[PDB]
Symmetry: C3
Subunit: 114 residues, 3 copies
């Protein structure tokens, strides 16, 4: 699983341990070992959501499987919850793109997962 | 709609208001209310296009629908036009990836659009 | 072809010429003229792979065609090889997403490739 977060929130506002919490919560949520989970936080971005510069986030979750209608719906609750509580970003100023990656299309350790 | 721009152009060369102009032009171009449009500009990047370090840009437009052969062709005119005029990037040093997102795959405000 | 690399490795650790080597190796590997190859390196990122902050990388290769089971497998060898040798990132701390882009979905120079 790979979670990326781009946000206008300053680096200083990213709580220590945020990456750890995301790895842990996403591991539970997807049912994958934490060791397979990679997380990326990109703060201080030049962004606008709806033409406003208020705190917002553009994210994406890539996963070989574990992506689907109902699952994505609960990932959004989990993720928006985390972003709201930890980064103080309003849930309606967050977009999360979900990608069900094919194993043959995910390279890792000199090969792919196919 | 979500528009991202990665470019080697310095932050100082990004005109104030560029994010607003993008929001407005993309809203018109896609026929979506400006409030649904999110824009992201990432300057000062370590990039190379064709092996050259001259100003270039790697972009992506994600949209639930409003993506297609003809539409994408005019988006490129609009976007390359804006990048050329506002960031002085030559149109032939710009790649834009278009993504027709499924509503069930776009999370927002604790749920998805499905 | 478009190759992006996000890594926690410091900017100072990115060897001069790395972008050039990537452009050249990817050109050979995909069988495309170097002029069509765009490369992007994003260092100093706040990342975690498996909950660890040791050097890691999250990458993606987008290409109109030239994407497939066997090809992706050798791209991973090539790419992990380069990342390991030039950025000292362990191959098992690298994820590379492969995207076979439809020509109608790749904008360039005021139009698309369709």
């Amino acid at each position: 699983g790979m979670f990326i977060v781009n946000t206008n929130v300053p680096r200083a506002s990213v709580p220590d341990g945020f990456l750890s919490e995301l790895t842990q919560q996403l591991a539970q949520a997807t049912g994958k070992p934490p060791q397979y989970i990679a997380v990326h936080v990109v703060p201080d971005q030049l962004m606008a959501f709806g033409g406003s510069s208020e705190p917002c986030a553009l994210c994406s979750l890539h996963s070989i499987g574990k992506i689907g209608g109902a699952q994505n719906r609960s990932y959004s609750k989990l993720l928006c919850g985390l972003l709201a509580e930890r980064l103080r970003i309003s849930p309606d100023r967050v977009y999360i793109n979900y990608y069900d990656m094919n194993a043959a299309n995910v390279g890792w350790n000199n090969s792919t997962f196919a």
